[PDB]
Amino acid sequence: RRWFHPNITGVEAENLLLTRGVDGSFLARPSNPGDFTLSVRRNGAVTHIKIQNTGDYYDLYGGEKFATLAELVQYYMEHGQLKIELKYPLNCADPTSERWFHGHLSGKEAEKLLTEKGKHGSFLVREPGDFVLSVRTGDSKVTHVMIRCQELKYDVGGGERFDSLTDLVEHYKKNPMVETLGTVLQLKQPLNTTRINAAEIESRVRELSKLQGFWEEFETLQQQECKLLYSRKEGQRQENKNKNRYKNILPFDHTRVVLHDGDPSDYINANIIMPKSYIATQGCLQNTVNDFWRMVFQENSRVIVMTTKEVERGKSKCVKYWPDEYALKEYGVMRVRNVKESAAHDYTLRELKLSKVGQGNTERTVWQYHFRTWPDHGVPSDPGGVLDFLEEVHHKQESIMDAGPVVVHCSAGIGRTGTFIVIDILIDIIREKGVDCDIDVPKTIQMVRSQRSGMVQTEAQYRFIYMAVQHYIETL
Numbered sequence: 064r065r066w067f068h069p070n071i072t073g074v075e076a077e078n079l080l081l082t083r084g085v086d087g088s089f090l091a092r093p094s095n096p097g098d099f100t101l102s103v104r105r106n107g108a109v110t111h112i113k114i115q116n117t118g119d120y121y122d123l124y125g126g127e128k129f130a131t132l133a134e135l136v137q138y139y140m141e142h143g144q145l146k147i148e149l150k151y152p153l154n155c156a157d158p159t160s161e162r163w164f165h166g167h168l169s170g171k172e173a174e175k176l177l178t179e180k181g182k183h184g185s186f187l188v189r190e191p192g193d194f195v196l197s198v199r200t201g202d203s204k205v206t207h208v209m210i211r212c213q214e215l216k217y218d219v220g221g222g223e224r225f226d227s228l229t230d231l232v233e234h235y236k237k238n239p240m241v242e243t244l245g246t247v248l249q250l251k252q253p254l255n256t257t258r259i260n261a262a263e264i265e266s267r268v269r270e271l272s273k274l275q276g277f278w279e280e281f282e283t284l285q286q287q288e289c290k291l292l293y294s295r296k297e298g299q300r301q302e303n304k305n306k307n308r309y310k311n312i313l314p315f316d317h318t319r320v321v322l323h324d325g326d327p328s329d330y331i332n333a334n335i336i337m338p339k340s341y342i343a344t345q346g347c348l349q350n351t352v353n354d355f356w357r358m359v360f361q362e363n364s365r366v367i368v369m370t371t372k373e374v375e376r377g378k379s380k381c382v383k384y385w386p387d388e389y390a391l392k393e394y395g396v397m398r399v400r401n402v403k404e405s406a407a408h409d410y411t412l413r414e415l416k417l418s419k420v421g422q423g424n425t426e427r428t429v430w431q432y433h434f435r436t437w438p439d440h441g442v443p444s445d446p447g448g449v450l451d452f453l454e455e456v457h458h459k460q461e462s463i464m465d466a467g468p469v470v471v472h473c474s475a476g477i478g479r480t481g482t483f484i485v486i487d488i489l490i491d492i493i494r495e496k497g498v499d500c501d502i503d504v505p506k507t508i509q510m511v512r513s514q515r516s517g518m519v520q521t522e523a524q525y526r527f528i529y530m531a532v533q534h535y536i537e538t539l
């Protein structure tokens with residue numbers, strides 16, 4: 064993912080592509096903050112293509128919709144689809160989005176962090192133009208290795224000279240430095256500085272709010288998305304193409320929900336998310352409504368969380384897959400009765416009875432929580448509404464013996480869906496373990512992203528997750 068440059072301007076991108084790149088060279092960068100730009104060299108000139116993300120997916124102008132920028136780049140690198148060829152990534156030497164880079168951090172602060180939070184092989188790199196690599200080794204001690212910047216290259220006092228700190232760190236990760244008395248300076252894992260005690264969320268949010276800290280942390284998490292390019296072959300099959308809301312937003316094969324008692328049709332664009340478990344899925348299409356009810360029935364799910372209106376901005380985000388109040392409908396082999404609807408400030412609850420046609424004894428109540436007030440773009444200005452809704456959903460799920468995973472869906476099933484699920488996972492740790500628990504927001508999001516592509520889409524949702532956890536702790 065070195066083709067992503069976090070701090071460059073359009074003019075800097077043009078100069079880099081014209082002087083250091085060739086026809087086919089490309090890079091991606093942040094823009095209108097919140098948007099991204101794909102800058103590509105074609106026939107000696109540079110084109111800048113807009114990538115928009117309001118919270119549901121990355122929408123590339125003149126291209127398709129994607130779950131992640133890594134999935135977008137992999138797609139165009141492996142497929143005449145962009146109207147523009149993406150042949151050569153133009154690599155970024157900026158270390159600001161590396162997990163181990165801590166810019167302005169003093170040697171005392173670094174020794175304190177490695178001593179309190181580190182273990183064998185924990186390391187960090189901190190900054191007049193030179194850098195310091197600090198490593199903890201043991202069962203213990205901290206060793207500081209000077210990294211010189213001499214004529215644009217980096218070195219540890221001898222040997223190879225690297226074009227970037229990333230190349231240096233990767234080199235000495237593969238080929239560890241050995242102290243002449245035997246100690247191997249193993250760079251096993253970056254020092255974890257994101258894991259906080261829940262009671263100090265206010266302090267961490269205040270520090271992330273200064274010039275912003277939230278942006279740096281989010282883009283450092285985004286930089287790790289290239290480790291999550293898991294196969295999605297089942298969703299790519301000809302017979303499954305029209306079962307996807309967006310052709311390139313697909314479920315990972317290894318966590319997808321497989322539908323078993325089919326017409327003698329094992330596919331649905333949905334994934335199991337394990338942290339209480341969840342099913343993260345897209346809004347129904349007219350041709351997937353029956354598959355949706357087959358999934359809910361098979362998985363024994365008793366609670367559904369819908370995080371979109373049926374229509375937003377004049378566009379269908381989810382077809383109505385449930386009957387009108389008091390009505391009974393058959394959706395293939397499944398029968399649904401809408402027993403009763405209850406309106407609340409931010410949501411509507413629909414009490415549904417689901418059963419298999421011809422088998423009365425299979426009836427179970429499915430409670431559908433339909434959140435109605437999420438803004439068309441961005442996130443809510445206050446998390447209270449989302450928190451009170453998730454608290455109600457949680458108590459409903461907890462009251463039902465052996466209930467299956469909670470189904471959560473929005474439009475593509477990754478942005479608002481990932482946001483609700485991640486807040487739910489974090490607040491569950493705090494409800495049970497109390498305020499004396501460790502929480503790690505990027506760790507939790509990375510874990511959820513390994514089970515469905517692009518879970519949590521934007522820096523605005525990333526910040527909303529911290530705000531929701533802070534609010535939950537303040538009302539404890």
Ligand SMILES: CC1(N)CCN(c2cnc(Sc3cccc(Cl)c3Cl)c(N)n2)CC1
Nearest residue numbers: 162164165257279280283284287505506509
């Ligand atoms: C100060 C910094 N420049 C920015 C903040 N920081 C940093 C480091 N790593 C991450 S990702 C991450 C975190 C925990 C577990 C997993 Cl699994 C992952 Cl993937 C992140 N979002 N931020 C340390 C370096």
